[PDB]
Write a protein that binds this ligand. Structure first.
Ligand code: Y5X
Lengths: 14, 263
C-alpha cells in the first residue's frame, strides 16, 4: 500500500 | 566534448553509481540476459506456455487483489535494494527526509518496471528466480481481467530493450528516475534538480561513450520515462477494472503464484 510502502522506505532509510 | 576535470568527475560519478548498483542489486541485467539467451547452463528455466505445461511445472513454482498483495509483498526486497542504492547517490541523504521518502515512493514503481524489462524478451518473462519462463502469449490468453495485466509491460519492455542498455547505463538511468523534481508533494525542489542535473550530465556522457551506434539515445531513453509513467498510472485503472468485472475471476493456483512474481 502507499502507507505500507512509505513505512518500508522509511525503515530502509534508517 | 573534451576530457577535462568536469568530464573526469562525471566518469567517476558513473563508476561510483555502477559500483553501488552492483552492490545493491544482486540480479543484474547481464545475469538475466545470460539466462534468456541460453548461456546460464547452471540454470535452464522451465518453459510455461499453456495449461498443460503449467501443470507439468507444479514442482518448480478476491483473486486479483490477492495477487497484488502478494506481488507487493514479494517486491519489498526490491524496494529495500532501491532505497539502499538511493543512499549511495551523492547528495541524496542530505535532502529533507520527507523529500527522500517522496522521491522513493514514486520512483520505486518506475524502477521496478525498468528492472522487469531485463527479465523480459518478446516471448515471455523469467519467473521463480530465473528457474522458470512464462510466455507472453500464454499470459495474454488468460481470461479477463488477468490477460490484460502484463501485455502493456511486454510492449514497453520490447521497446526499452531495443535500446540495448547495459548495467552501467541502467545504474545512471535509475538514479535519474529517483532524483525527479516533478514528484508531487516535494518540499525543496531545487536541491533535487541540482543532483539530477549532475546525474543527467553523467548519463549523457555515459551514453555517448558507450553507444556510438545510437545518436539520440539520451533523448530516446528519457522518453521511455513517459511509458514507465503511463504503466504506473494505469495500475490504478486495473484496480477499477477489477471492481467492475462482474464475471468469474477464478484463476489456477499456480497461475496466481506466477503472477505474484510479476508487477
Ligand atoms: C503485482 C503482480 C502482478 C501484477 N500484474 O500482473 O499486473 C501487478 C502487481 C502490482 O501490484 N503492481 C503494482 C503495484 N504497486 C504499484 C504499481 F505501479 C504496480
Amino acid at each position: 500500500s502507499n502507507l505500507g510502502l512509505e513505512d518500508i522506505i522509511r525503515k530502509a532509510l534508517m | 566534448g573534451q576530457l577535462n576535470p568536469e568530464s573526469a568527475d562525471l566518469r567517476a560519478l558513473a563508476k561510483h553509481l555502477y559500483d553501488s548498483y552492483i552492490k545493491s542489486f544482486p540480479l543484474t541485467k547481464a545475469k538475466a540476459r545470460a539466462i534468456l539467451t541460453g548461456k546460464t547452463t547452471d540454470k535452464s528455466p522451465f518453459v510455461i506456455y499453456d495449461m498443460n505445461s503449467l501443470m507439468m511445472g507444479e514442482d518448480k513454482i478476491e483473486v486479483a487483489i490477492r495477487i497484488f498483495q502478494g506481488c507487493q509483498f514479494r517486491s519489498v526486497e526490491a524496494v529495500q535494494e532501491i532505497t539502499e542504492y538511493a543512499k549511495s547517490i551523492p547528495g541524496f541523504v542530505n535532502l529533507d527526509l520527507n523529500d527522500q521518502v517522496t522521491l522513493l515512493k514514486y520512483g520505486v514503481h518506475e524502477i521496478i518496471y525498468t528492472m522487469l524489462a531485463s527479465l523480459m524478451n518478446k516471448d515471455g518473462v523469467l519467473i521463480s528466480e530465473g528457474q522458470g519462463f512464462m510466455t507472453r502469449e500464454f499470459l495474454k490468453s488468460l481470461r479477463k481481467p488477468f490477460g490484460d495485466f502484463m501485455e502493456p509491460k511486454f510492449e514497453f519492455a520490447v521497446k526499452f530493450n531495443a535500446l540495448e542498455l547495459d548495467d552501467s547505463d541502467l545504474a545512471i538511468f535509475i538514479a535519474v528516475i529517483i532524483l525527479s523534481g516533478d514528484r508531487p508533494g516535494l518540499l525543496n525542489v531545487k536541491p533535487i534538480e541540482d543532483i539530477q542535473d549532475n546525474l543527467l550530465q553523467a548519463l549523457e556522457l555515459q551514453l555517448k561513450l558507450n553507444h556510438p551506434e545510437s545518436s539520440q539515445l539520451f533523448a530516446k531513453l528519457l522518453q521511455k520515462m513517459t511509458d514507465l509513467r503511463q504503466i504506473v498510472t494505469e495500475h490504478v485503472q486495473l484496480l477499477q477494472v477489477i471492481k467492475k468485472t462482474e464475471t468469474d475471476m477464478s484463476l489456477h493456483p499456480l497461475l496466481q503464484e506466477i503472477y505474484k512474481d510479476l508487477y
